[PDB]
Amino acid sequence: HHHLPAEEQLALIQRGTHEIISEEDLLKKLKENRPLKIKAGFDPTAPDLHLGHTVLINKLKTFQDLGHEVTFLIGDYTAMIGDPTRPPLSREQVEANAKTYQEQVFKILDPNKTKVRFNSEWFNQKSAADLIQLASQQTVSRMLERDDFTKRYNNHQPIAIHEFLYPLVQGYDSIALEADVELGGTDQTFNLLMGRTLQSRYGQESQVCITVPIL
Numbered sequence: 001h002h003h004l005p006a007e008e009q010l011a012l013i014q015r016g017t018h019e020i021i022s023e024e025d026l027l028k029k030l031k032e033n034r035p036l037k038i039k040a041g042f043d044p045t046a047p048d049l050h051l052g053h054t055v056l057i058n059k060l061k062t063f064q065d066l067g068h069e070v071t072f073l074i075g076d077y078t079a080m081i082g083d084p085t086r087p088p089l090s091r092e093q094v095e096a097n098a099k100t101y102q103e104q105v106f107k108i109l110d111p112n113k114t115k116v117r118f119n120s121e122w123f124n125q126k127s128a129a130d131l132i133q134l135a136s137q138q139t140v141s142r143m144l145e146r147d148d149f150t151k152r153y154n155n156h157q158p159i160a161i162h163e164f165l166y167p168l169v170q171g172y173d174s175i176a177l178e179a180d181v182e183l184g185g186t187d188q189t190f191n192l193l194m195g196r197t198l199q200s201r202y203g204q205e206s207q208v209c210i211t212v213p214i215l
């Protein structure tokens with residue numbers, strides 16, 4: 001009735017997913033009978049999204065057709081930070097690549113119902129002190145559990161320290177968006193849980209994390 005019953009939405013949402021960190025909390029959010037904020041983030045370095053993102057985008061469409069609010073999030077903030085004088089992305093590259101992603105995903109999603117946002121929109125105004133505050137919320141040993149970090153460390157390959165900050169940027173993005181749900185590939189599990197974790201540390205209701213296989 002304007003919004004499908006919560007248990008039916010659940011059945012449609014979980015079809016084709018590998019994991020949902022807290023079915024219990026997703027049901028609780030759906031029973032609130034309100035538009036949920038759906039976060040899906042993309043790295044703007046590639047020329048396009050490959051044909052394996054399809055399940056992911058059709059899951060965002062499922063959320064959109066159930067009345068929920070999808071934020072298409074471009075993570076330009078970290079991509080544009082260079083080395084103190086290999087170049088980073090320029091703003092013109094971010095904008096050009098982002099336009100191509102939108103031409104793609106709006107063959108599926110509705111543009112009048114989708115929010116396109118760039119995480120530099122809030123992070124460009126964060127101070128070093130705001131990032132030190134964020135960095136105090138996770139430990140070194142927890143960051144070293146991310147599978148790619150664990151392999152590099154075990155093979156004594158260098159891990160620059162700012163690479164530990166990148167998951168914290170992604171987590172904070174959930175806070176600034178007030179994400180109810182975040183979607184990603186099964187490879188991005190660690191990073192999606194970062195936002196759920198950091199939301200609690202900041203006194204926010206935590207997001208549900210949903211992974212789909214990225215073919």
Ligand SMILES: N[C@@H](Cc1ccc(O)cc1)C(=O)O
Binds near residue numbers: 170171
């Ligand atoms: N870091 C993610 C992309 C991303 C960026 C910012 C976010 O808030 C969320 C996701 C990746 O490597 O694909």
Ligand SMILES: [Mg+2]
Binds near residue numbers: 116117118121
């Ligand atoms: Mg923006």
